[PDB]
């Protein structure tokens, strides 16, 4: 039966490749017929010795003889034999290492230029992990824009800005615009109003929270005034007004006024 069939397999009757085969199966777990070809095939894609080169592909033949074109399937094969070991060199270790291992990979395979037809297909989405869930960080969400250009070269503007906001605030002005321009290197360059509606609803919390009880809203000012009750907080502007006047340096002179012109411009 499938019992005299496997007993026909008693024909192929390898121990090695046979065992290894079924072994590669029952284990990994399945068309008794299927893996049969499978394992064999990649076993052939191996190193030659004129007669093994023969028995193998020769029985590899008696195989198609079994199944008995569909042989495009021997392409769905290496396909993953690639994709796997492929994206294997995924997480940035591109090198001459990839270069190296890779080729040789497609070597013990068929694969015409199709290589690329995946080389990136992989490298491609290879990013779709990171820059997709760029949230779980922002320096990475940017790290995408870092390398997610290196290889591959919609609220995509949201993080773009958020990662631009958090990064910019923590973080010259116009060449850093080039850092926010790294964002225009992902999103449009006209979404400053999703930037402003994104950098405006931030200043507040500092106003609301710094402004609450004992000593200062001078801090929530220094950093929130790092942008570009009513007179009460205009006193933090008064507070540093003198507190800042901690040197009366040439600049201290100009940064104190316009700034105090901002809390003053952002009057109330």
Quick tags:
monomer; 268 residues; mainly alpha; 16 helices; 59% helix; protein transport
| Overall 3D shape | rod-shaped
Distance between the termini: 90 Å
The number of helical elements comes to: 16
The helical percent reads 55-70%
Radius of gyration: 32 Å
Order of helices and strands: HHHHHHHHHHHHHHHH
Strand tally, please? 0
Please give the largest β-sheet: none
- Proportion of strand residues: under 5%
Instruction: Return the structural class.
Output: mainly alpha
Protein name: Similar to chloroplast inner membrane protein Tic110
Organism: Cyanidioschyzon merolae (strain NIES-3377 / 10D)
Structure write-up:
The protein has 268 residues and is mostly helical. Among the domains are: 2-68, no CATH class; 211-262, no CATH class. 59% of the residues lie in helices and 0% in strands. The protein has 16 helices and no strands. It is rod-shaped, with a radius of gyration of 32 Å. The relative contact order is 0.04. It is classed as protein transport. Keywords: protein transport. The assembly is monomeric.
Can I get a quick summary?
This is Similar to chloroplast inner membrane protein Tic110. With 268 residues, the protein is mostly helical.
């Amino acid at each position: 039966s499938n019992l005299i069939d496997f007993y026909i397999r008693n024909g192929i009757l390898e121990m090695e490749n046979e065992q290894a085969v079924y072994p590669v199966n029952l284990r990994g777990v399945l068309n008794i017929l299927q893996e049969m070809y499978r394992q064999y095939l990649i076993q052939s894609f191996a190193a030659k010795s004129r007669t093994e080169k023969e028995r193998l592909f020769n029985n590899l033949a008696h195989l198609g003889n079994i199944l008995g074109v569909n042989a495009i399937h021997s392409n769905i094969g290496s396909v993953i034999y690639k994709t796997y070991a492929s994206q294997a060199l995924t997480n940035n270790r591109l090198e001459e290492k990839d270069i190296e291992f890779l080729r040789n990979i497609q070597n013990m395979l068929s694969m015409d230029e199709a290589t690329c037809r995946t080389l990136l297909q992989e490298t491609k989405e290879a990013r779709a992990g990171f820059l997709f869930d760029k949230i779980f960080m922002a320096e990475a969400v940017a790290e995408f824009r870092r390398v997610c250009r290196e290889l591959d070269v919609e609220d995509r503007r949201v993080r773009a800005f958020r990662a631009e906001i958090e990064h910019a605030i923590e973080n010259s002005l116009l060449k850093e615009s080039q850092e926010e321009l790294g964002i225009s290197a992902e999103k449009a360059r006209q979404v400053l109003l999703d930037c402003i509606q994104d950098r405006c609803e931030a200043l507040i919390v500092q106003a609301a929270a710094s402004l609450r009880q004992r000593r200062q809203e001078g801090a929530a000012r220094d950093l929130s005034r790092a942008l570009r009750q009513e007179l009460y907080l205009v006193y933090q502007a008064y507070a540093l007004g003198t507190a800042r006047s901690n040197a009366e340096n040439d600049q201290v002179k100009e940064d104190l006024a316009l700034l105090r012109e901002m809390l003053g411009i952002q009057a109330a």
